[PDB]
Each structure stands twice: as C-alpha cells, then as structure tokens.
Short mmCIF file of C-alpha atoms in Angstrom, two decimals:
data_model
loop_
_atom_site.label_atom_id
_atom_site.label_comp_id
_atom_site.label_asym_id
_atom_site.label_seq_id
_atom_site.Cartn_x
_atom_site.Cartn_y
_atom_site.Cartn_z
CA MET A 1 38.16 -26.52 20.32
CA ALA A 2 35.10 -25.81 22.22
CA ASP A 3 35.86 -25.43 26.12
CA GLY A 4 38.17 -22.78 24.95
CA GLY A 5 34.76 -21.02 24.28
CA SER A 6 33.13 -22.17 27.24
CA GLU A 7 35.64 -20.65 29.58
CA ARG A 8 36.13 -17.49 27.36
CA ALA A 9 32.30 -16.91 27.84
CA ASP A 10 32.18 -17.53 31.21
CA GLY A 11 34.96 -15.20 31.66
CA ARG A 12 33.46 -12.32 29.59
CA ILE A 13 30.10 -12.59 30.69
CA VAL A 14 30.99 -10.71 33.83
CA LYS A 15 32.72 -7.98 31.72
CA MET A 16 29.64 -7.98 29.41
CA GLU A 17 27.28 -7.57 32.28
CA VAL A 18 29.69 -4.72 33.81
CA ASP A 19 31.44 -3.18 31.10
CA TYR A 20 30.32 -1.49 27.77
CA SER A 21 28.60 -3.22 25.04
CA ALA A 22 31.61 -2.08 22.83
CA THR A 23 33.33 -5.21 24.24
CA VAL A 24 31.23 -6.88 21.64
CA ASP A 25 34.37 -5.77 19.23
CA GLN A 26 36.87 -7.59 20.86
CA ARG A 27 34.65 -10.71 21.01
CA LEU A 28 33.83 -10.12 17.39
CA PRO A 29 37.15 -11.30 15.56
CA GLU A 30 38.37 -14.10 17.77
CA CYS A 31 35.00 -16.07 17.86
CA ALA A 32 34.79 -15.42 13.81
CA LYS A 33 37.79 -17.73 13.31
CA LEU A 34 36.37 -20.08 15.37
CA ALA A 35 33.54 -20.21 13.29
CA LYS A 36 35.79 -20.13 10.47
CA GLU A 37 37.28 -23.27 11.83
CA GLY A 38 34.40 -25.79 11.56
CA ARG A 39 36.91 -28.85 12.63
CA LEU A 40 34.37 -30.52 15.18
CA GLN A 41 30.84 -31.43 14.76
CA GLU A 42 30.07 -29.61 18.16
CA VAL A 43 32.78 -27.08 18.11
CA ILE A 44 31.23 -24.72 15.57
CA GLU A 45 27.87 -25.38 17.36
CA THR A 46 29.06 -24.05 20.65
CA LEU A 47 31.14 -21.46 18.84
CA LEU A 48 27.57 -19.95 17.11
CA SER A 49 25.62 -20.77 20.45
CA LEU A 50 27.72 -18.80 22.85
CA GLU A 51 27.98 -15.89 20.12
CA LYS A 52 24.32 -15.76 19.61
CA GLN A 53 23.62 -16.13 23.33
CA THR A 54 25.96 -13.42 24.43
CA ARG A 55 24.76 -11.27 21.50
CA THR A 56 21.18 -12.02 22.58
CA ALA A 57 22.36 -11.14 26.37
CA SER A 58 24.16 -7.81 25.08
CA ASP A 59 21.02 -6.71 22.95
CA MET A 60 18.40 -7.53 26.10
CA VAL A 61 20.73 -5.04 28.09
CA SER A 62 20.87 -2.55 25.56
CA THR A 63 17.27 -2.90 24.53
CA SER A 64 16.35 -2.56 28.26
CA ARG A 65 17.39 0.88 28.16
CA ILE A 66 17.06 3.23 24.91
CA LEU A 67 19.41 1.08 23.11
CA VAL A 68 17.30 -1.17 21.34
CA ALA A 69 16.79 0.14 17.69
CA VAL A 70 19.81 1.95 17.47
CA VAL A 71 21.75 -1.22 18.21
CA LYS A 72 19.66 -4.18 17.08
CA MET A 73 20.08 -3.36 13.25
CA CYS A 74 23.95 -3.31 13.86
CA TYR A 75 23.77 -6.53 15.24
CA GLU A 76 21.93 -8.39 13.06
CA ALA A 77 23.56 -7.20 9.74
CA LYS A 78 26.96 -7.84 11.51
CA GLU A 79 26.02 -11.74 12.44
CA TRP A 80 24.68 -12.01 8.50
CA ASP A 81 27.81 -10.41 7.17
CA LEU A 82 29.95 -12.83 9.83
CA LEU A 83 28.06 -15.52 8.58
CA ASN A 84 29.23 -14.49 4.99
CA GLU A 85 32.81 -14.28 6.49
CA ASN A 86 32.21 -17.37 8.35
CA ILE A 87 31.26 -20.28 6.35
CA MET A 88 28.63 -19.63 3.96
CA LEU A 89 24.98 -20.37 4.56
CA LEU A 90 25.28 -19.75 8.46
CA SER A 91 28.31 -21.78 9.00
CA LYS A 92 26.96 -25.62 8.69
#
C-alpha cells in the first residue's frame, strides 16, 4: 500500500543522487498506477508526497547546474498531466 512506496523511495534515492535524471522515467509509471489506486486514505497521500519530494530533489539537483529551465517546464507539465491521468483534481 504505502510502505512499498517508502522502501522504493529509500532504495531509489541513492541512484537518484548517483545515476542520471532520466531515471525519472522509471519512477513515473509505477508511481502513476499508485496514484491511480486511491485505495487507502494515506496511501495516495504518501504516493504523491514521495513522488513530489523526489521530483523536487531531482529538480534542485538539475537546477543547481544548468538544467534549471529546460527541465522544470517538463517536470511541471508532466506533473499536471499525471494529475489528469491519475484521479482528476490532483488525485484526491
């Protein structure tokens, strides 16, 4: 439900700090279905929380370097699209 997201985030933060930002791709889809779940009260709360925090971390790492503007627009538009593809109106 939720602890799966916790362990996944804790295990993917390491490669997020190390590996490329393109890893975002392999965290977009599996998270989205989680956001599509909405089964429990805090499960989608933690899903959106972790996805947001991780996306923010990647954003701040990229914008620390030159990848500030060329990727923040993509991040935000994709987050609103994911909102559309997940439950409408920003999930719950």
